Amino acid sequence: LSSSLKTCYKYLNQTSRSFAAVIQALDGEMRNAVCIFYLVLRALDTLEDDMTISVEKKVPLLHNFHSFLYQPDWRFMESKEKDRQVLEDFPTISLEFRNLAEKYQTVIADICRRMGIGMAEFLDKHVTSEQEWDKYCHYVAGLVGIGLSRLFSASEFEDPLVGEDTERANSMGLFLQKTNIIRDYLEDQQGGREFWPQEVWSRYVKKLGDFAKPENIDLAVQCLNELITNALHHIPDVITYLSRLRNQSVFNFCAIPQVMAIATLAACYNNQQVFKGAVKIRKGQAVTLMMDATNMPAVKAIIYQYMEEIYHRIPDSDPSSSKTRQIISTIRTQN
Numbered sequence: 001l002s003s004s005l006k007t008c009y010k011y012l013n014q015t016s017r018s019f020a021a022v023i024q025a026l027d028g029e030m031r032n033a034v035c036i037f038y039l040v041l042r043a044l045d046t047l048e049d050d051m052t053i054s055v056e057k058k059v060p061l062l063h064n065f066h067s068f069l070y071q072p073d074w075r076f077m078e079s080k081e082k083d084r085q086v087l088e089d090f091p092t093i094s095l096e097f098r099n100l101a102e103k104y105q106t107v108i109a110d111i112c113r114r115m116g117i118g119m120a121e122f123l124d125k126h127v128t129s130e131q132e133w134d135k136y137c138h139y140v141a142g143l144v145g146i147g148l149s150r151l152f153s154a155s156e157f158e159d160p161l162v163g164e165d166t167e168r169a170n171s172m173g174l175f176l177q178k179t180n181i182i183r184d185y186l187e188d189q190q191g192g193r194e195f196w197p198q199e200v201w202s203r204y205v206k207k208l209g210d211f212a213k214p215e216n217i218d219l220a221v222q223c224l225n226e227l228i229t230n231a232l233h234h235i236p237d238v239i240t241y242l243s244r245l246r247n248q249s250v251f252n253f254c255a256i257p258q259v260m261a262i263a264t265l266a267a268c269y270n271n272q273q274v275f276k277g278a279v280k281i282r283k284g285q286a287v288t289l290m291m292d293a294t295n296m297p298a299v300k301a302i303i304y305q306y307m308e309e310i311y312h313r314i315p316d317s318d319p320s321s322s323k324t325r326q327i328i329s330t331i332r333t334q335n
């Protein structure tokens with residue numbers, strides 16, 4: 001490994017922690033292409049996230065980020081976020097980008113161009129409709145699923161359908177992103193961020209911060225249940241997506257995040273604790289999920305088990321109850 005690629009893997013371990021191993025297990029040219037894409041997206045996210053960067057400066061940064069990949073000297077020295085090293089040392093990451101085969105460079109660049117446009121559009125707004133929530137999630141997450149899929153197909157480790165079916169790929173990203181958004185309600189509130197869709201929360205309370213107050217806990221949990229029900233709608237696509245993967249290392253890479261998201265949603269379902277802190281699955285639970293999630297029968301078994309758990313906890317008076325039961329039933333009877 002060049003020193004510059006070695007530095008990239010150091011940043012990958014610093015940024016992705018124990019998921020770094022799963023990336024490092026990817027076969028052949030996939031390994032480096034995903035590592036670099038991971039880092040480049042981390043840089044883009046860090047720009048988007050940084051509230052100390054003004055809108056007039058942020059918009060050009062997001063629009064032009066795809067171009068910076070091709071500018072050997074481009075870096076950004078003014079960030080105040082946790083992962084700011086990937087921006088300060090962007091030249092090292094962009095050098096390794098430019099060492100990828102062109103078929104992987106062009107995927108990453110195109111994705112960054114489109115994600116930038118979409119991120120720039122949401123600087124000025126909160127998410128209103130569920131349709132807008134899917135549009136926002138496409139920009140920040142769904143496009144990541146689509147990019148990764150295109151790397152898998154372009155490397156020829158997976159059939160071209162994996163890269164072409166943008167909707168199944170998009171669903172992979174939306175499932176993770178909506179799960180994060182749901183779970184991070186309170187941490188977001190405290191950082192002054194709002195991602196729950198206004199059209200949903202506005203039917204329970206007047207302001208989204210209201211869900212943190214004790215008198216509204218019943219309403220908060222109803223909204224939580226409704227948004228979780230929304231996220232579950234992506235699981236048929238997730239199953240379809242995973243069922244097409246033929247490469248073991250790619251399977252594990254895609255499957256492990258999804259089962260951990262499923263278990264997280266199950267933990268969060270009808271759970272007051274979402275409104276008081278960060279509900280997380282136990283480390284030993286996570287490890288077992290990661291070790292188990294390596295073939296379709298086992299992933300389906302995990303999904304069905306957590307969905308049955310949710311099913312049996314649905315309160316009769318929950319306003320989303322028959323929608324929750326309906327999507328769980330669809331998932332169960334598909335595979």
Ligand SMILES: COc1ccccc1[C@H]1OCCN([C@@H]2CCC[C@H](C(=O)O)C2)C(=O)CC(=O)N(CC(C)(C)C)c2ccc(Cl)cc21
Binds near residue numbers: 144
């Ligand atoms: C659409 O996303 C995928 C599709 C197929 C395969 C992998 C991913 C995903 O990585 C897995 C999620 N993840 C870990 C996995 C282990 C448990 C960890 C935990 O905190 O519990 C979280 C990540 O660190 C990265 C991440 O969150 N995203 C998803 C986003 C885009 C919704 C923010 C991500 C970013 C870039 C790249 Cl190159 C991949 C990924």
